[PDB]
Amino acid sequence: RFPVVNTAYGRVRGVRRELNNEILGPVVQFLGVPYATPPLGARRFQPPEAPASWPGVRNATTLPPACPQNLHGALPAIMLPVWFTDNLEAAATYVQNQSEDCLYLNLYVPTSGKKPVMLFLHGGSYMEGTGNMFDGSVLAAYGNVIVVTLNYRLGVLGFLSTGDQAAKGNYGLLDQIQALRWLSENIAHFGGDPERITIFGSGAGASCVNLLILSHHSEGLFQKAIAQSGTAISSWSVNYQPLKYTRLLAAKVGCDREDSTEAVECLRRKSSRELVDQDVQPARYHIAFGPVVDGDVVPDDPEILMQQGEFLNYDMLIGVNQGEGLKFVEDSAESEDGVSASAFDFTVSNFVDNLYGYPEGKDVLRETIKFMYTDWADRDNGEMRRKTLLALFTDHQWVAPAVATAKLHADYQSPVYFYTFYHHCQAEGRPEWADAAHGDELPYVFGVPMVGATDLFPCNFSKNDVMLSAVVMTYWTNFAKTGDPNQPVPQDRFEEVVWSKFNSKEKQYLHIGLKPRVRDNYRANKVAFWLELVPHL
Amino acid sequence: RFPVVNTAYGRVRGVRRELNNEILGPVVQFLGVPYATPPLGARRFQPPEAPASWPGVRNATTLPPACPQNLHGALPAIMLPVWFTDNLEAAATYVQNQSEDCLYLNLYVPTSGKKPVMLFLHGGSYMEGTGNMFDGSVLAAYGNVIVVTLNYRLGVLGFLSTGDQAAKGNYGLLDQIQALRWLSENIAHFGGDPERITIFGSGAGASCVNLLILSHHSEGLFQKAIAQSGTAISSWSVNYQPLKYTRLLAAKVGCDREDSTEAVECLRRKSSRELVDQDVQPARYHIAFGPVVDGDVVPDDPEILMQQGEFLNYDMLIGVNQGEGLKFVEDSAESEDGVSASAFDFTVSNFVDNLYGYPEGKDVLRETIKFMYTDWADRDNGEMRRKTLLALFTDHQWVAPAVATAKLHADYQSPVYFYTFYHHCQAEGRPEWADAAHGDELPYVFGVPMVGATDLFPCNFSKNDVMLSAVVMTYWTNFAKTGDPNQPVPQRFEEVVWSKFNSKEKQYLHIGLKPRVRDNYRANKVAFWLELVPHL
Amino acid sequence: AGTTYIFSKGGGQITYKWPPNDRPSTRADRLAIGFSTVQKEAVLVRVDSSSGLGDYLELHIHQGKIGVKFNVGTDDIAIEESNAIINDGKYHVVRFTRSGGNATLQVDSWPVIERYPAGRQLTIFNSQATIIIGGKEQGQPFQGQLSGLYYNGLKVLNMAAENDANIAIVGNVRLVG
Amino acid sequence: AGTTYIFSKGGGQITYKWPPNDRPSTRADRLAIGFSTVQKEAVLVRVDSSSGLGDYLELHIHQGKIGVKFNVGTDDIAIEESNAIINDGKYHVVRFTRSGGNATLQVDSWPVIERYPAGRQLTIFNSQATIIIGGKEQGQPFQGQLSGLYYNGLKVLNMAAENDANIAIVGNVRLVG
Numbered sequence A: 001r002f003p004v005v006n007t008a009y010g011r012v013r014g015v016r017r018e019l020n021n022e023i024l025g026p027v028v029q030f031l032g033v034p035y036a037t038p039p040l041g042a043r044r045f046q047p048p049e050a051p052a053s054w055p056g057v058r059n060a061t062t063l064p065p066a067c068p069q070n071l072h073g074a075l076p077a078i079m080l081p082v083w084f085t086d087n088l089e090a091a092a093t094y095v096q097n098q099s100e101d102c103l104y105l106n107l108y109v110p111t112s113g114k115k116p117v118m119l120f121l122h123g124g125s126y127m128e129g130t131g132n133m134f135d136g137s138v139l140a141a142y143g144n145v146i147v148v149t150l151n152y153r154l155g156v157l158g159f160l161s162t163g164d165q166a167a168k169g170n171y172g173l174l175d176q177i178q179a180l181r182w183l184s185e186n187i188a189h190f191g192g193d194p195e196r197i198t199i200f201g202s203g204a205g206a207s208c209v210n211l212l213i214l215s216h217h218s219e220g221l222f223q224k225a226i227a228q229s230g231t232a233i234s235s236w237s238v239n240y241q242p243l244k245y246t247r248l249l250a251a252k253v254g255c256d257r258e259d260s261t262e263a264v265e266c267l268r269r270k271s272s273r274e275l276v277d278q279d280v281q282p283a284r285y286h287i288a289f290g291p292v293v294d295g296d297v298v299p300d301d302p303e304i305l306m307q308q309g310e311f312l313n314y315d316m317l318i319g320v321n322q323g324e325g326l327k328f329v330e331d332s333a334e335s336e337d338g339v340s341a342s343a344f345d346f347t348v349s350n351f352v353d354n355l356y357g358y359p360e361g362k363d364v365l366r367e368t369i370k371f372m373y374t375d376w377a378d379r380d381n382g383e384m385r386r387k388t389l390l391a392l393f394t395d396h397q398w399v400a401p402a403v404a405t406a407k408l409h410a411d412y413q414s415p416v417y418f419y420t421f422y423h424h425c426q427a428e429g430r431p432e433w434a435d436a437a438h439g440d441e442l443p444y445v446f447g448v449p450m451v452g453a454t455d456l457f458p459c460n461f462s463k464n465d466v467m468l469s470a471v472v473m474t475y476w477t478n479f480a481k482t483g484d485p486n487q488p489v490p491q492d493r494f495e496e497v498v499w500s501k502f503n504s505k506e507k508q509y510l511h512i513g514l515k516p517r518v519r520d521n522y523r524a525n526k527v528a529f530w531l532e533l534v535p536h537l
Numbered sequence B: 001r002f003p004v005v006n007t008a009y010g011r012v013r014g015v016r017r018e019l020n021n022e023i024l025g026p027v028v029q030f031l032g033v034p035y036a037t038p039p040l041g042a043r044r045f046q047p048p049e050a051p052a053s054w055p056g057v058r059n060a061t062t063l064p065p066a067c068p069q070n071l072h073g074a075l076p077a078i079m080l081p082v083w084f085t086d087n088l089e090a091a092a093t094y095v096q097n098q099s100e101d102c103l104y105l106n107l108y109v110p111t112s113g114k115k116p117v118m119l120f121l122h123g124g125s126y127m128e129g130t131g132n133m134f135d136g137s138v139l140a141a142y143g144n145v146i147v148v149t150l151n152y153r154l155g156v157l158g159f160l161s162t163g164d165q166a167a168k169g170n171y172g173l174l175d176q177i178q179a180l181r182w183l184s185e186n187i188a189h190f191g192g193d194p195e196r197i198t199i200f201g202s203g204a205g206a207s208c209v210n211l212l213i214l215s216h217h218s219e220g221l222f223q224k225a226i227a228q229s230g231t232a233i234s235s236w237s238v239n240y241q242p243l244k245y246t247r248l249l250a251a252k253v254g255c256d257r258e259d260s261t262e263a264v265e266c267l268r269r270k271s272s273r274e275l276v277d278q279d280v281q282p283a284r285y286h287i288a289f290g291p292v293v294d295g296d297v298v299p300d301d302p303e304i305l306m307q308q309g310e311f312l313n314y315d316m317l318i319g320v321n322q323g324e325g326l327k328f329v330e331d332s333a334e335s336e337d338g339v340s341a342s343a344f345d346f347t348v349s350n351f352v353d354n355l356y357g358y359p360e361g362k363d364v365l366r367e368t369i370k371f372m373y374t375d376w377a378d379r380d381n382g383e384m385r386r387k388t389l390l391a392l393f394t395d396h397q398w399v400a401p402a403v404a405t406a407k408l409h410a411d412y413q414s415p416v417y418f419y420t421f422y423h424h425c426q427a428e429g430r431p432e433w434a435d436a437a438h439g440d441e442l443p444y445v446f447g448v449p450m451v452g453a454t455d456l457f458p459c460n461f462s463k464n465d466v467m468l469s470a471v472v473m474t475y476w477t478n479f480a481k482t483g484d485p486n487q488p489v490p491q492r493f494e495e496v497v498w499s500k501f502n503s504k505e506k507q508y509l510h511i512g513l514k515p516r517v518r519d520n521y522r523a524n525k526v527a528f529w530l531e532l533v534p535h536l
Numbered sequence C, D: 001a002g003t004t005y006i007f008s009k010g011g012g013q014i015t016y017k018w019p020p021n022d023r024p025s026t027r028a029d030r031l032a033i034g035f036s037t038v039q040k041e042a043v044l045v046r047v048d049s050s051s052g053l054g055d056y057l058e059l060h061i062h063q064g065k066i067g068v069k070f071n072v073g074t075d076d077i078a079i080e081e082s083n084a085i086i087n088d089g090k091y092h093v094v095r096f097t098r099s100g101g102n103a104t105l106q107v108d109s110w111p112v113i114e115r116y117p118a119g120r121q122l123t124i125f126n127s128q129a130t131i132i133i134g135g136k137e138q139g140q141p142f143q144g145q146l147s148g149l150y151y152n153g154l155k156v157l158n159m160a161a162e163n164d165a166n167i168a169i170v171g172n173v174r175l176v177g
């Protein structure tokens, strides 16, 4: 049957898709429910507003169009999830109907109060990715929670800014906030609970989560947050030089006026495909178009906002994969041995030149991070130099910022649960020495192993993978229900382990994997090196 | 039975003391044989000369007098062995007859035909000690080697220098080399072999051993070396500014003339007891009177010399203990918890100030050696700060120089055997958390456990200590016999084969109750001190 | 005209403790109370953060003038009604609205006082833990009558007469009727 | 004349290798050998170290002048009998005494050439490994007659004639008798 439901703007018709598995009930899907007016013409580069009511019944059974993007271009190939850049041809199937009026969202409703809502902020960078890639229907039926997956403006059309009021920027963040507002004031009609809205995302989307915590625009819209593999303080989280890249794009497209408003208007007069398919390359380990520190959405530098405690006590579930810098070591991933000592001194030097570049501390810092990231008991192993390079990139970009944000959130008494993900599905082209890479927790959170391999995830899933997917889905849904991964639904070696909080004095975390155990400190030596010694050099 | 052996200068009479233990045979001790003319008058502050023949038979039974010194004064307590500082009252008994005529050596002949010789170069620092404290008779009777313990000029009278030709310095090293020459030209008469003369020592005496390897004076006198807990490249092994302290001592004594020759001539007039008693305090972790680079005995500073292969292929048996800076953490050894953070950072800052003192690399270096020596997983222990401070001192002063000199010797194709000592005798006043401190391998090498507790070593020795002493003495005597601690006398200790210390793979043996041939001793911290600190 | 609580000889204090897992942090606050006393110096309501944090909000009478002093992290900002006589024994009502660094104070029907401290100011009151009524521990005991403590929808005086588990009464505080 | 050896057409090389445990390092090097040849460009005696070390000693006839060039660590030091001609087919005895940097080269009864190089000089010939006679591998093979190569108390030719276990012969090196 087609269970039409009435919203504050009208009525919409959905479907009743039946799941492959025999332990999951049917899920009602409303695909393509709009939440903001189409920003096509003079509303381009303006914050979104409420939609237009429609008479009669709206017909929502097909996936909405994607936002304009150039997938087959010079994407940032480091920050993207590994499964995205491996199966890039299959990912282009979903981005086929790219249209500017892409502001829609898809709700998956399962069939002990009203069901909680879980909004998903997708993305690997800010210039790619659509919500149709993830079928949030297995997660909805298993956890008895409503799962929402949206589309928001990406890249040039959503984050272009100049610094002044001609184009402030952060249009994607305001689109996400508008979607949260629509959920807050319209989810009770769908059976959801508008006071238990958990918001979660992996990768660049995760950064958006940590920027929606610090925005006063999203005050009472949500209550919890699950930020996995991403922070607001990494090198590629925000854009501190938006004017430079904006002017570069304006010159490339064909109009660069010394007055910002004139150039912005000219860009507004240009077709989306013409200004999206252009190629503007950012500096390495940085972004061209992304969130901008202006004063309305993000008041200050995110590294400074959370040190002074400018957030409203959101329950947090942060996490890190074992090795995520798997694309740092890619030119040497097809060699019998690891990286040579002549090349291990080269990648580190380029790393320092691209991330610090300080004329003073360029020779003392480089030598000390060369000394720290080498196994002195195996100084001439070869492979245990590629491994340490991967560990270096993971520690600098993903582990140290995650632990820093966890400590800053815990020091102001907000419940923080830290997790580490180790297991990974046996892919096709993945090297044997590799481990859980960036974005290799999404299959388990979204219940892919319970429906088998898809075009995006072609690994073969065993019984252990299904058990792990069930466990992590139970953890996530327990968090969305009660704000504590153990309270509502007990586990059914995962049974007897109790997940503890993350106190700054003793940084308890959970080591999610085939052999879980509540450990006590994640890479304490290297995390302390990156947080406490490097600033002194 | 007082056997009489004729030397190249005369005839000496020994004894035939028999040991308390049953397995060990009797020995013959020629305690008191001279090896150089006494430096009383104008021969003071001069290199030693060969002795004068005495007509008749000379009694060699009494322990000869020690060299002038002053223990109950200002001594560097950090570098001295733990057993010397703890039982100082009993140690001062041996040095009671301090006379300027202290050039004597003691032989302990046991009872292939010729026997190996092992000279012992004593001295925890350069101001104190005597050869009488080490009754090297169990080692002689067990391993069937001839142990020789000597006395050499110490402190002011044997190491005073001005840099110029008024006083070249290193009179103690010259006395030791003269004793080695006497052994080389006179040990065949006692049954020993003039071709297998090992020299071994612990503490600053071991430094002498290393300084005896780079000196062209001791070219063919000896053939091996066993340097334990000592180096010639550490901070307190060579005096680099002797003129300053010599001038301070001259001013304190009562004559400080601008002319070095006149000052030395005035000093020679003073009594041996006047200038010994005066104190001359050096900077922390340094020495006032000690070996001086002059071009005669030590051509250049030892660090440079062993870089450019200026040694003559001497087999080496180097080693260290687990914790030797036990006196670095002494003011905090009587507390409920360990060193607090406000005190840990203060001790590290004082360490850096006293040892490096570089105005530029001051806060970059202190921060990184603070970060390296702290367990971050258990950061706020308090008690696991004493352990890291002790490990920091041990690593800087004893382990890093030992590994550096072992690599430098092994890089020029000369055998090096590296050992690490862990088991220590259970004393009375030693803390439970402590471990084998400086000079705690000396009871085992000299076979104290096989005779029992003495005044200098008040522990008891159980069966484990006796077994370990037997093992260590077997290793040392095998090295003396053939330059390889495994060949002549086979021995947990039977399956272990001691391997050469190769620079590429730093193999070593881990002497203790549970021995094992390990692979890299503290690779992280040693690499920190040898390959990162120079870059800051 | 709510649950009026009478202070008596010696002193007294009312304590509201939030559940440890539900300590709220608010960008804006509203503190309303009617009171009647003749004390020249007193501390009526003092709101504290959790352990260690220096975030606090206090309503107090200094030299007879009522005023609100709060610390949100940068500097202690105080807005005080001084151009009136309020401790004359009559029943007065005081309402304080804080929005970020901006503050607004109103007493009875006298015109509102606005305070806009200069510079960039922190806006978030971090992890409120305890509401203190009476100022016994502050050093200025209260002798008078209080009515209607409305604080972000948590009327502590309303629940005080209901013997709520989280409310603590220590001292000579008395309730009419 | 001692145990004379003759080098035929094409030449050859005779090699004495120290055991890997008994490699001698020596401060003072002594060489002495009699020879008879008419060659102009050849290398006779080659002393090398083990792997890595740059220490070596060479005896060579260049431009009709016999000389010795040794590297002890600082630089190559060469001393040649320039003021004479030696390759006249007669029996000539050459000796060479080394002391660190100082070197004395003597031939027959002609006055000894002395060399005292300036500056800081290394002295130790570290870890001598093999002694080479013939110089075929160097690039200047030798063809003539040799007798009694004295090298620090090692009568190399005599022990080679005695057929020791540490001496090897290759090429056209032949015994006289």
Ligand SMILES: *[C@@H]1O[C@H](CO)[C@@H](O)[C@H](O)[C@H]1NC(C)=O
Pocket (backbone or CB within 6 Å): A002, A059, A060, A061
């Ligand atoms: C929903 O829409 C499609 C196309 O807009 C239409 O073909 C279909 O019949 C609709 N579903 C109904 C009317 O149930």
Ligand SMILES: *[C@@H]1O[C@H](CO)[C@@H](O)[C@H](O)[C@H]1NC(C)=O
Pocket (backbone or CB within 6 Å): A426, A427, A428, A458, A459, A460, A461
């Ligand atoms: C699944 O298993 C088959 C057969 O072993 C293998 O060829 C294929 O690559 C596997 N696929 C994945 C992603 O595991």
Ligand SMILES: *[C@@H]1O[C@H](CO)[C@@H](O)[C@H](O)[C@H]1NC(C)=O
Pocket (backbone or CB within 6 Å): B056, B057, B058, B059
């Ligand atoms: C040696 O000692 C004996 C007694 O022990 C004594 O009678 C004799 O005079 C001594 N001779 C010398 C030369 O000291």
Ligand SMILES: *[C@@H]1O[C@H](CO)[C@@H](O)[C@H](O)[C@H]1NC(C)=O
Pocket (backbone or CB within 6 Å): B460, B461, B462
């Ligand atoms: C040595 O003294 C300790 C003191 O506790 C004791 O435990 C041990 O048994 C003693 N050993 C002998 C052999 O007396």
Ligand SMILES: *[C@@H]1O[C@H](CO)[C@@H](O)[C@H](O)[C@H]1NC(C)=O
Pocket (backbone or CB within 6 Å): C099, C100, C101, C102, C116, C123
């Ligand atoms: C405080 O007042 C100023 C002036 O109108 C305003 O710009 C600012 O947004 C206000 N702050 C808050 C937190 O309301």
Ligand SMILES: *[C@@H]1O[C@H](CO)[C@@H](O)[C@H](O)[C@H]1NC(C)=O
Pocket (backbone or CB within 6 Å): D099, D100, D101, D102, D116, D123
């Ligand atoms: C070379 O001769 C000079 C001349 O006195 C001498 O000083 C020097 O020590 C000699 N070199 C060596 C290595 O002995």
Ligand SMILES: [Ca+2]
Pocket (backbone or CB within 6 Å): A308, A309, C055, C072, C073, C122, C124, C125, C126
């Ligand atoms: Ca605050």
Ligand SMILES: [Ca+2]
Pocket (backbone or CB within 6 Å): B308, B309, D055, D072, D073, D122, D123, D124, D125, D126
């Ligand atoms: Ca050399």
